C-alpha cells in the first residue's frame, strides 16, 4: 500500500551529485551547523552529495564533506545529522517525465517534499505539494 506512484528516474548512485533546483537555480546545501539551504555557488564545498539506496526507490542523501545526512523533522524542516534514522529516508521519484523529487518516507502520507525556494531558502514540508516548482531537482555530475 503506497501513497505515491513508482515512476523512477534514470541513473545510479555510483558517483556523487549536485542536487540542482530548476526553480531558482540553487544547489542543495547542508551546512556544517546542520542547517540546510541552497546556493548558486558551484564551488561551495557543502553541495556535493552522495545518494545511496535502501529499498528500491528509497534513498539517503549524504554530504561528502561533513558526513551529514539530509533529514526532515516532524514539523517538516530539513536538517543535517551525523546519525541516519527513519527521518532521513526519501522516496526518489521521476516527476513531469524529467525531474527528480524527494518525498519524506516517514511523512509520505502528508506529501511532504524536499524543496528549495527561488530565494535559496529550503521549503518546509507542509508548505510543499505536488505541482510546485520548488520540489523539482536535477542530479548533476560533480565531475
Phi, psi values for residue 114, rounded to 5°: -65, 130
By what technique were these coordinates determined?
X-ray
23 labeled part of a ligand binding site: yes
Which residues are CB-contacts of 108 (< 8 A; sequence separation ≥ 6)? 2, 3, 4, 91
CA distance 65 to 126: 29
Which residues are CB-contacts of 52 (< 8 A; sequence separation ≥ 6)? 13, 59, 60, 62
The CATH number covering residue 93 comes to: 2.80.10.50
What is the separation of C-alpha 72 from the centre of its chain, rounded to a whole number of angstroms?
10
Q: Say how many domains are in the chain.
A: 1
User: Domain limits at 9?
Assistant: 1-143
Reduced to 3 states, what is the DSSP secondary structure of residue 122?
strand
Q: What is the DSSP string of 6-68?
A: ----S--SSS-EEEEETTT-PEEEE-TTS-EEEE--TT-TT--EEEEESSTTEEEEEETTT-P
Nearest to 62 by CA among 82, 76, 85, 77: 82
Which residues are CB-contacts of 100 (< 8 A; sequence separation ≥ 6)? 9, 19, 92, 93, 94, 136, 137, 138, 139
Cβ atoms of 70 and 78 closer than 8 Å: yes
Cβ atoms of 135 and 101 closer than 8 Å: yes
Cell of 121: 531558502
DSSP state of 116: B
DSSP state of 83: S
Q: Characterize 48-77 residue by residue with b for buried, 16 or more Cβ atoms within 10 angstroms of its Cβ, and e for exposed.
A: bbbbeeeeebebbbbbbebebbbbbeeebe
Cell of 56: 528500491
Tell me the β-bridge partners of 72.
Answer: 78
CA distance 126 to 75: 8
Cβ atoms of 89 and 58 closer than 8 Å: yes
**Calculated CA dihedral for residues 28, 31, 36, 37, nearest 10 degrees:** -60
Amino acid at each position: 500500500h503506497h501513497h505515491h506512484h513508482f515512476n523512477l528516474p534514470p541513473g545510479n548512485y555510483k558517483k556523487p551529485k549536485l542536487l540542482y533546483s530548476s526553480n531558482g537555480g540553487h544547489f542543495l546545501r547542508i551546512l556544517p551547523d546542520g542547517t540546510v539551504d541552497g546556493t548558486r555557488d558551484r564551488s561551495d564545498q557543502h553541495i556535493q552529495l552522495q545518494l545511496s539506496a535502501e529499498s528500491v526507490g528509497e534513498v539517503y542523501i549524504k554530504s561528502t564533506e561533513t558526513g551529514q545526512y539530509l533529514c526532515m523533522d516532524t514539523d517538516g524542516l530539513l536538517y543535517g545529522s551525523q546519525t541516519p534514522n527513519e527521518e532521513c529516508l526519501f522516496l526518489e521519484r521521476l516527476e513531469e517525465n524529467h525531474y527528480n523529487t524527494y518525498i519524506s518516507k516517514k511523512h509520505a502520507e502528508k506529501n511532504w517534499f524536499v524543496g528549495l525556494k527561488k530565494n535559496g531558502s529550503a521549503k518546509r514540508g507542509p508548505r510543499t505539494h505536488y505541482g510546485q516548482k520548488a520540489i523539482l531537482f536535477l542530479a548533476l555530475p560533480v565531475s
